[PDB]
Amino acid sequence: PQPISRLEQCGINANDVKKLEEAGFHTVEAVAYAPKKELINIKGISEAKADKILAEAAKLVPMGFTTATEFHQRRSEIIQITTGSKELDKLLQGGIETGSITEMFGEFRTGKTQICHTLAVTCQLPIDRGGGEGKAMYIDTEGTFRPERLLAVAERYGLSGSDVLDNVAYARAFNTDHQTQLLYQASAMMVESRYALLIVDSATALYRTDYSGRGELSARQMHLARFLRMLLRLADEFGVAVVITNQVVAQVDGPKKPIGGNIIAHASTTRLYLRKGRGETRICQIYDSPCLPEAEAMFAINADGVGD
Amino acid sequence: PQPISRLEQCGINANDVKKLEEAGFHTVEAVAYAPKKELINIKGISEAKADKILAEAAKLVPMGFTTATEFHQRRSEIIQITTGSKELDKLLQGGIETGSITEMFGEFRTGKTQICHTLAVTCQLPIDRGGGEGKAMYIDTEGTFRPERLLAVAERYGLSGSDVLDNVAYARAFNTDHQTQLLYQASAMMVESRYALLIVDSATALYRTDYSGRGELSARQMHLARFLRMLLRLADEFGVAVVITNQVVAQVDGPKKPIGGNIIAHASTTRLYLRKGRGETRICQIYDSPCLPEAEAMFAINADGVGD
Amino acid sequence: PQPISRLEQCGINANDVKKLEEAGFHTVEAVAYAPKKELINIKGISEAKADKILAEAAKLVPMGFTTATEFHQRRSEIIQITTGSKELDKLLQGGIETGSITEMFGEFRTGKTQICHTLAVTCQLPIDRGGGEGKAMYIDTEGTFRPERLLAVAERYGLSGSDVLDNVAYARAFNTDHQTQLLYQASAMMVESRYALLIVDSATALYRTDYSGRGELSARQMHLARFLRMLLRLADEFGVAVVITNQVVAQVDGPKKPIGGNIIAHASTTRLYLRKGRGETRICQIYDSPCLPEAEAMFAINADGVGD
DNA sequence: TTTTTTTTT
Ligand SMILES: Nc1ncnc2c1ncn2[C@@H]1O[C@H](COP(=O)(O)OP(=O)(O)NP(=O)(O)O)[C@@H](O)[C@H]1O
Ligand SMILES: Nc1ncnc2c1ncn2[C@@H]1O[C@H](COP(=O)(O)OP(=O)(O)NP(=O)(O)O)[C@@H](O)[C@H]1O
Numbered sequence: 040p041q042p043i044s045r046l047e048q049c050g051i052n053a054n055d056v057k058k059l060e061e062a063g064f065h066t067v068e069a070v071a072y073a074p075k076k077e078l079i080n081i082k083g084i085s086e087a088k089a090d091k092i093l094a095e096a097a098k099l100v101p102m103g104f105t106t107a108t109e110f111h112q113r114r115s116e117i118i119q120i121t122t123g124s125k126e127l128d129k130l131l132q133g134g135i136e137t138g139s140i141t142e143m144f145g146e147f148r149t150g151k152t153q154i155c156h157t158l159a160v161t162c163q164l165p166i167d168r169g170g171g172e173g174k175a176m177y178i179d180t181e182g183t184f185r186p187e188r189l190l191a192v193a194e195r196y197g198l199s200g201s202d203v204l205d206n207v208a209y210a211r212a213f214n215t216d217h218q219t220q221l222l223y224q225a226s227a228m229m230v231e232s233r234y235a236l237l238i239v240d241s242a243t244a245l246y247r248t249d250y251s252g253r254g255e256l257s258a259r260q261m262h263l264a265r266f267l268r269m270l271l272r273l274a275d276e277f278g279v280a281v282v283i284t285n286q287v288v289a290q291v292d293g294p295k296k297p298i299g300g301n302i303i304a305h306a307s308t309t310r311l312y313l314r315k316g317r318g319e320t321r322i323c324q325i326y327d328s329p330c331l332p333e334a335e336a337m338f339a340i341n342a343d344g345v346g347d
Numbered sequence: 348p349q350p351i352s353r354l355e356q357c358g359i360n361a362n363d364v365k366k367l368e369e370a371g372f373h374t375v376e377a378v379a380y381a382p383k384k385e386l387i388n389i390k391g392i393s394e395a396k397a398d399k400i401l402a403e404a405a406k407l408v409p410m411g412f413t414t415a416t417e418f419h420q421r422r423s424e425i426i427q428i429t430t431g432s433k434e435l436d437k438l439l440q441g442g443i444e445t446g447s448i449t450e451m452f453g454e455f456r457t458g459k460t461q462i463c464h465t466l467a468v469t470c471q472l473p474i475d476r477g478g479g480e481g482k483a484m485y486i487d488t489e490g491t492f493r494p495e496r497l498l499a500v501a502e503r504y505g506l507s508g509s510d511v512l513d514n515v516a517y518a519r520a521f522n523t524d525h526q527t528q529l530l531y532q533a534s535a536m537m538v539e540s541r542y543a544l545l546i547v548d549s550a551t552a553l554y555r556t557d558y559s560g561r562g563e564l565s566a567r568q569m570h571l572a573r574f575l576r577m578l579l580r581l582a583d584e585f586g587v588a589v590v591i592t593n594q595v596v597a598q599v600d601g602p603k604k605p606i607g608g609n610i611i612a613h614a615s616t617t618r619l620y621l622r623k624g625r626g627e628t629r630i631c632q633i634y635d636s637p638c639l640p641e642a643e644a645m646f647a648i649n650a651d652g653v654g655d
Numbered sequence: 656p657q658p659i660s661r662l663e664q665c666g667i668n669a670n671d672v673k674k675l676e677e678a679g680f681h682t683v684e685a686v687a688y689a690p691k692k693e694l695i696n697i698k699g700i701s702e703a704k705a706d707k708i709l710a711e712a713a714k715l716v717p718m719g720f721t722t723a724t725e726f727h728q729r730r731s732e733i734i735q736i737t738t739g740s741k742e743l744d745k746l747l748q749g750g751i752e753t754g755s756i757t758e759m760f761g762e763f764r765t766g767k768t769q770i771c772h773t774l775a776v777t778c779q780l781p782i783d784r785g786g787g788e789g790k791a792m793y794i795d796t797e798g799t800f801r802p803e804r805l806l807a808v809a810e811r812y813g814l815s816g817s818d819v820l821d822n823v824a825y826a827r828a829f830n831t832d833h834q835t836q837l838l839y840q841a842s843a844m845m846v847e848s849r850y851a852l853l854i855v856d857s858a859t860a861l862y863r864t865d866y867s868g869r870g871e872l873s874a875r876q877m878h879l880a881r882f883l884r885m886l887l888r889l890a891d892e893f894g895v896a897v898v899i900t901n902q903v904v905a906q907v908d909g910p911k912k913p914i915g916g917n918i919i920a921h922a923s924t925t926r927l928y929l930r931k932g933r934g935e936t937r938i939c940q941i942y943d944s945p946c947l948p949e950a951e952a953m954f955a956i957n958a959d960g961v962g963d
Numbered sequence: 964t965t966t967t968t969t970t971t972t
């Protein structure tokens with residue numbers, strides 16, 4: 040959460056750092072989490088300056104070994120914003136964690152984006168309501184974004200819908216290339232003030248299209264790396280939770296399978312494979328999380344969305 | 348396990364050696380396993396000093412020929428920490444060996460990191476339980492680290508979870524560049540006191556990302572060499588076991604394949620290709636080990652992890 | 656096989672020769688195969704002494720022209736130790752030759768080191784079994800050395816595993832710089848008593864690591880020359896067979912390729928490009944040998960290793 | 964001389 044001015048100290052020129060701001064960096068942790076070469080790669084830099092930028096970075100951010108008990112206390116610290124549905128929350132154990140990544144597995148008609156709206160509303164909630172209390176930025180590629188729904192879950196909780204719209208920042212994307220731009224813009228938006236949650240219903244979606252198969256292939260994946268990694272960094276510098284929604288290919292052989300292949304799957308700190316039962320009610324089975332036993336349970340898609 | 352003070356003998360200045368500590372070295376074996384040039388490359392050194400540092404190094408560490416029977420007795424000596432599952436242990440023949448390297452082959456949802464937590468817990472175990480009795484340092488790039496799980500396998504065995512957290516040292520990485528830093532920090536952490544196991548769930552993971560293809564390529568590989576080699580040295584100076592977890596590309600042609608290419612594969616003293624069957628149960632097929640016939644067998648992923 | 660005492664004759668001081676022993680030389684052939692300058696370069700020498708050392712060297716070792724029929728008879732003389740597998744032996748025409756060099760081409764998981772263990776066991780065998788009857792010294796950089804396996808192929812043939820361990824001398828290396836040291840140590844070990852085979856699974860391996868690219872490059876190669884040449888000399892003074900195992904880079908362009916570049920390839924008297932089929936069975940294609948037509952054939956990796 | 968990346972439906 041910490042501005043580089045605190046690194047803008049101990050003799051570094053302000054100017055070059057101001058150049059650094061342009062590249063994307065804004066946190067002290069940015070350099071604390073900076074790849075060395077990539078910081079060197081900004082022009083208007085002498086490498087030794089990068090070296091001492093690392094010096095002050097290390098100086099204000101520990102990155103060495105720490106005791107297990109400590110990190111254990113940090114795992115106490117995670118506010119983990121609630122779904123707004125008690126029993127997904129019991130599935131997720133207190134809801135989606137702060138500073139992590141999430142996945143939506145589904146065909147269509149599932150309401151996964153609907154989940155994402157309900158989350159975007161509930162993030163404003165005071166922690167006693169299970170919220171994280173932070174402004175929310177939402178990015179949609181299909182443009183489905185439903186401020187109406189924001190007003191709806193606002194009606195579910197009574198905080199003014201105008202306050203709901205006070206947060207949630209929506210920019211319509213299109214390129215995979217635009218996404219990263221939205222990400223750095225997101226960063227600059229961040230250090231201004233605390234945010235709760237990043238949402239991307241369709242982080243996968245653009246890649247099927249900008250890249251028409253195949254090979255590419257690698258190149259397609261090659262960009263998600265550059266994409267997905269950044270997401271981590273954001274969560275790594277604010278604790279901001281991260282939600283990813285994936286369109287799922289049909290599997291063919293002799294089924295589903297998430298798109299974006301393995302490279303998404305490794306970054307995938309957690310996974311949620313959704314399904315449709317009768318009615319609003321839909322089935323939610325967990326995959327891939329250290330936090331949790333694999334399991335499943337139902338949740339409804341009400342006029343105010345996720346609940347019972 | 349032997350501090351350089353024992354080399355800090357027979358006339359060498361303490362100071363220059365204190366400079367050597369800074370470069371990374373801490374063991375007598377470090378110089379006993381030192382490349383010549385690289386020791387010379389530390390500043391504040393005259394080369395002849397390096398020469399006589401080799402003199403005392405050889406003086407306290409044999410590096411010449413030895414009888415096969417002797418090394419055979421050392422192969423009796425390997426405690427080889429058990430998995431906590433008897434039948435992987437029968438696959439691995441008494442579990443993962445001390446002072447070696449290991450590999451996790453899997454897609455996602457496999458529990459390979461889960462294996463790594465269970466190992467991190469079991470390392471504390473007395474040798475009769477198949478443990479090595481040593482403090483454990485765990486490094487995670489995806490941050491999945493699950494102290495909860497540590498408490499869990501603690502419940503599996505009853506040693507206090509607080510004791511479990513007494514060991515296992517966790518530092519969150521990010522750069523490939525940070526990794527090596529964590530490694531030297533690891534060394535300094537080592538010579539302080541005995542450790543059992545190094546774990547890295549995602550030693551491969553950062554390289555896909557810091558390096559976006561291609562070429563690079565070589566450079567990417569070029570770093571893993573510098574990385575992987577160090578791991579050996581650690582195991583070569585403490586007997587500390589080493590676990591590597593690799594994210595696996597999809598293979599495309601007309602399948603899986605481990606990432607990091609050949610250069611990982613050569614260092615790979617052993618390999619474990621994992622798969623998902625139904626339920627907690629997952630399939631474990633061995634690759635690439637002098638120790639073992641190639642084979643496979645099942646193991647479950649319980650609430651306390653690896654077992655039956 | 657001939658000690659310098661036979662050169663320690665016709666008036667040379669014993670002392671200076673004793674100094675020569677220190678530099679590395681031990682055979683009469685050493686000076687018979689000595690570079691002039693390098694012998695002069697030992698201190699405590701007057702050049703004329705080197706001159707007359709050449710005089711006695713020539714005096715006890717012919718180095719002039721000889722008839723083709725004679726060398727043809729020597730090509731009858733090569734015992735060429737068998738693989739322990741009849742059909743590699745038919746590939747290699749009677750197995751690996753005495754006093755030559757060999758190469759392992761493979762990715763990983765190939766069993767090339769496994770071949771090297773099986774060879775190390777079979778060298779003890781009486782010539783009727785296709786062995787050379789000699790003690791075997793094995794050097795491993797990755798430490799994979801498997802005395803267990805020695806006992807295993809011992810079980811394959813029934814000579815006591817204790818006798819197997821009576822030979823095979825194992826020293827763990829690490830530097831490229833250490834290697835040469837192990838080589839001179841090897842020499843001193845040699846003239847003591849006859850040996851069959853030198854083995855180095857990983858003569859290439861250390862160079863990727865001690866030298867991080869590039870340039871270096873030349874320097875890297877520069878050392879292998881100094882390395883590989885010595886190997887020849889050993890084989891040139893004992894008939895000891897020489898086995899080299901090479902880790903193979905991925906080739907990239909628009910494949911494999913052996914590492915160490917051309918300079919290894921020229922010394923390479925022979926080459927064996929290995930591959931993996933199904934099961935224990937692996938594919939062996941010959942490259943680069945005057946002796947042989949280029950060809951390939953299968954061989955299995957049994958519990959007792961190379962065979963059918 | 965060094966050096967693999969990458970699923971779609
Ligand atoms: N006001 C509402 N009341 C009840 N159900 C609603 C309401 N609004 C939307 N839904 C349901 O929410 C779902 C909307 O589709 P949804 O699955 O959210 O799109 P998606 O998951 O993004 N699939 P796609 O749009 O193809 O990418 C449907 O099941 C709708 O019936
Ligand atoms: N308490 C638990 N009880 C049972 N199973 C569990 C429990 N916690 C985790 N698991 C299982 O362990 C696995 C966790 O995913 P895992 O394969 O360990 O991540 P991973 O191997 O690192 N893949 P990735 O995270 O994408 O790099 C899943 O199969 C979970 O269902």
Ligand SMILES: Nc1ncnc2c1ncn2[C@@H]1O[C@H](COP(=O)(O)OP(=O)(O)NP(=O)(O)O)[C@@H](O)[C@H]1O
Binds near residue numbers: 769
């Ligand atoms: N007892 C055994 N029975 C059957 N096969 C075995 C046995 N021991 C080892 N192997 C096989 O031998 C091979 C061991 O790997 P190997 O290729 O020898 O290492 P390598 O060639 O040196 N590659 P690397 O270790 O990365 O440098 C694998 O195919 C094992 O399955």
Ligand SMILES: [Mg+2]
Binds near residue numbers: 149150240
């Ligand atoms: Mg949706």
Ligand SMILES: [Mg+2]
Binds near residue numbers: 457461548
């Ligand atoms: Mg895992």
Ligand SMILES: [Mg+2]
Binds near residue numbers: 765767768769
């Ligand atoms: Mg081998």
